[PDB]
Design an enzyme around this catalytic site. Structure first.
Site, short mmCIF file in Angstrom:
data_model
loop_
_atom_site.label_atom_id
_atom_site.label_comp_id
_atom_site.label_asym_id
_atom_site.label_seq_id
_atom_site.Cartn_x
_atom_site.Cartn_y
_atom_site.Cartn_z
N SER A 44 19.92 35.36 14.08
CA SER A 44 19.26 34.07 13.83
C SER A 44 19.11 33.94 12.36
O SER A 44 19.03 32.62 12.04
CB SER A 44 17.86 34.17 14.35
OG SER A 44 17.89 34.22 15.74
N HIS B 40 9.73 31.08 13.51
CA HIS B 40 11.18 31.25 13.53
C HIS B 40 11.93 30.06 12.89
O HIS B 40 12.80 30.22 12.01
CB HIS B 40 11.61 31.40 14.99
CG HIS B 40 12.97 31.97 15.19
ND1 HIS B 40 14.06 31.19 15.52
CD2 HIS B 40 13.41 33.25 15.21
CE1 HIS B 40 15.11 31.96 15.71
NE2 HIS B 40 14.75 33.22 15.50
N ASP C 170 15.36 24.77 17.23
CA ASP C 170 14.63 26.02 17.11
C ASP C 170 13.17 25.82 17.54
O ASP C 170 12.90 24.97 18.39
CB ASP C 170 14.71 26.51 15.66
CG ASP C 170 14.71 27.97 15.54
OD1 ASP C 170 13.67 28.63 15.81
OD2 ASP C 170 15.73 28.54 15.17
N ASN D 246 21.71 39.77 19.38
CA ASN D 246 21.20 40.97 18.75
C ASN D 246 21.13 42.19 19.67
O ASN D 246 20.25 43.03 19.48
CB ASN D 246 19.79 40.73 18.16
CG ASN D 246 19.73 39.56 17.18
OD1 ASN D 246 20.72 39.22 16.51
ND2 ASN D 246 18.54 39.01 17.02
#
Ligand code: CA
Ligand code: CA
Ligand code: CA
Ligand code: CA
Ligand code: CA
Ligand code: CA
Ligand code: CA
Length: 318
Positions: free
Chosen positions: A244, A73, A35, A184
């Protein structure tokens, strides 16, 4: 720091009742999170960060400023898996699990496919740089090695890169469970790498058990992905939404299954396949213990259902 609270998603996936059996602190188990990096000294994370590494620009680095999260994130994702169960903040699905933060995305959340592929390789090789140090043929699930047992990828796009895929295949064959966000865009099928057969695609539900309209369809399982509070830089907390956020809930469930199975048998379960509905592999357990929402069985909104840790662990140990 604020007093600890339990995000709704952690209860939705039935994690707290597992902790008596294991909270993920079985030493052979690590979860690698590919990530934007991690706020490595966050008080609600630090003791669980075992490795903070970066593969940006094709350079493997453990310099703290290179591995630290410059976006937020990754810190949020990691907290969903592994925020400590203590007196502050939040708490993860597997609050005792060791984490490898593998920074494959930049400050903007973007990454190259070669850097992601290298990050996958690093999850296999681990901190010591060697895949199978004792030469016993076991990588994942071997306490003599430091390979991760779960690779969690809260990233995705339409591009299918064979170099990146070959690394995913390598990890899968090493016994590593791979988990990724379905995406998404409200698309009819998952983004890559979620769409690879070796990878568990995860869709997102809201607190009413409805699938999020943005959740890419045909996932393998679903999990909490709307109004998800977790850790955030700097030593802070933030609420985010996306597949996520769903992804780490599933990675945390996997970590619990494998920790509990090892704690009992001294080995881990094989990864399994999308079609598996037996209790003989991780994926089979996830599928048959999920809360089956929507049309009965696997469906394009929820996949096999909403993951449930307590039931999954019971199935693994039974
Ligand atoms: Ca390991
Ligand atoms: Ca906490
Ligand atoms: Ca190693
Ligand atoms: Ca070995
Ligand atoms: Ca060994
Ligand atoms: Ca910090
Ligand atoms: Ca269903």
């Amino acid at each position: 720091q604020p007093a600890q609270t339990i995000p709704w998603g952690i209860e939705r996936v039935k994690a707290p009742s597992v902790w008596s059996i294991t909270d993920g602190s079985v030493s052979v188990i690590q979860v690698a999170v590919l990530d934007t990096g991690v706020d490595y000294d966050h008080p609600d994370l630090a003791a669980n960060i075992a490795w903070c590494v970066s593969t940006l620009r094709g350079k493997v680095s453990t310099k703290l400023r290179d591995c630290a999260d410059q976006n937020g994130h990754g810190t949020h994702v990691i907290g969903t898996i592994a925020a400590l169960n203590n007196d502050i903040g939040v708490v993860g699905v597997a609050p005792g699990v060791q984490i490898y933060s593998v920074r494959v995305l930049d400050a903007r959340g973007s990454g190259s496919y070669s850097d992601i592929a290298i990050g996958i390789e690093q999850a296999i090789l681990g901190p010591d740089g060697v895949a199978d140090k004792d030469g016993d043929g076991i990588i994942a699930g071997d306490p003599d090695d430091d390979a991760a047992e779960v690779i969690s990828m809260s990233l995705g796009g339409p591009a299918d890169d064979s170099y990146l895929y070959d690394m995913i295949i390598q990890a899968y064959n090493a016994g590593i469970v791979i988990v990724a966000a379905s995406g998404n865009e409200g698309a009819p099928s998952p983004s890559y790498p979620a769409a690879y057969p070796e990878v568990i695609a995860v869709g997102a539900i809201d607190s009413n058990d409805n699938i999020a309209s943005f959740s890419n369809r045909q996932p393998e399982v679903s999990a909490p992905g709307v109004d998800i509070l977790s850790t955030y830089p700097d030593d802070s907390y933030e609420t985010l939404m996306g597949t996520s956020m769903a992804t780490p809930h599933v990675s945390g469930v996997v970590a619990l299954i494998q920790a509990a199975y090892y704690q009992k048998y001294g080995k881990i379960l094989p990864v399994g396949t999308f079609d598996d509905i037996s209790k003989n592999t991780v994926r089979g357990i996830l599928h048959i213990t999920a809360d089956d929402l929507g049309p009965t069985g696997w469906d394009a909104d929820y996949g096999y259902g909403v993951v449930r840790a307590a039931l999954a662990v019971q199935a693994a140990l039974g």
